[PDB]
Design an enzyme around this catalytic site. Structure first.
Site: not given
Ligand SMILES: [Mg+2]
Ligand SMILES: [Zn+2]
Ligand code: NA
Ligand SMILES: [Zn+2]
Ligand SMILES: [Zn+2]
Ligand SMILES: [Zn+2]
Lengths: 162, 162
Positions: B60, B97, B104, B118
């Site tokens: 985090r 993500h 990333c 998510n």
């Molecule tokens: Mg995710």
């Molecule tokens: Zn990425």
DNA sequence: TTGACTCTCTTAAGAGAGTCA
DNA sequence: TTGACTCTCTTAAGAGAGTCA
């Protein structure tokens, strides 16, 4: 501790008791635009729940039996699986609702798998929509679908490539 | 901070700093037996991370800027979405993500959606395997597959039906 | 031995805020 | 003002254990 016969007796008493829970007929998506029917055996919303059953959380229960003066207690959905390995690939096995109905204790609606496998069924397209679970889903997961994404990938400048 | 101009300035500064993170190429399953390539802009493993960035947990980070002589701070992946609604259908919007790579910070790999949406991408078959996400996945989810279920639905007696 | 409550914990996708220098 | 740490929290799929009569 408890012998195989004693564990079988626990499973049998649990089945006896759960089989008397109200049986609720639910129409459910199977995937592929098809609808099916599941019959859930639902623990009551408030006490009394059934012999051996008690609520430890809003949607959590435990089953308790006293054998040879020793109190034994299990998560209420784990009982069908007491003769199974309790971990796989170094991950704890969890009771996983194929019907996605927490109150249901029908053992024909439960499987025993890692928490990740368990969670993932929420998004499965279902047995008639492309389910690849080796232990097949009974229905399309409640969260399957296009989602409700608020904003997609984007940049203001030109610093990034995908 | 409060003004749209101030928010745009935050997004622009974030993009410029993240745009200087190392670009790591990851080859990824797309579904359907196909493979693609993603270019992730990865925050360093240890300090210093970049201007404005600090680690608050194992994976985090937070971005911080001083505006109006006050510190304003955000989760490090939330910055691209500062002009978007912060909730949807009464659920908190989260940075999600698409590349499944926590370090990333490429905004072309992020979307802004409920925690359920998510999470569900972890099991998606992917953009060449049947992804139905309206904001399309960039790859097959890392947890897609048959699973490793230890035991399936079963009963000892004759009290239950599916 | 039993019922009906009480409490806290796990996981892995995600968060906010305080302490120092 | 900026950096580098510290702590605890949220969610929704799941858990174990204590108290009292
Ligand atoms: Mg995710
Ligand atoms: Zn990425
Ligand atoms: Na489940
Ligand atoms: Zn059921
Ligand atoms: Zn499935
Ligand atoms: Zn998808």
């Amino acid at each position: 501790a408890l012998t195989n016969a004693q564990i079988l007796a626990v499973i049998d008493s649990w089945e006896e008791t759960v089989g008397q829970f109200p049986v609720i007929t639910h129409h459910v998506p199977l995937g592929g635009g098809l609808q099916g029917t599941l019959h859930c055996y639902e623990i009551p919303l408030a006490a009394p729940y059934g012999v051996g059953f008690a609520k430890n959380g809003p949607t959590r229960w435990q089953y308790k039996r006293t054998i040879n003066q020793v109190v034994h207690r299990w998560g209420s959905h784990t009982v069908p699986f007491l003769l199974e390995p309790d971990n796989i690939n170094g991950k704890t096995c969890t009771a996983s609702h194929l019907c996605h109905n927490t109150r249901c204790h029908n053992p024909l609606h439960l499987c025993w798998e890692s928490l990740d496998d368990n969670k993932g069924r929420n998004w499965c397209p279902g047995p008639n929509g492309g389910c690849v679970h080796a232990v097949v889903c009974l229905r399309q997961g409640p969260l399957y679908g296009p989602g409700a994404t608020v904003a997609g990938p984007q940049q203001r400048g030109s610093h990034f490539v995908v």
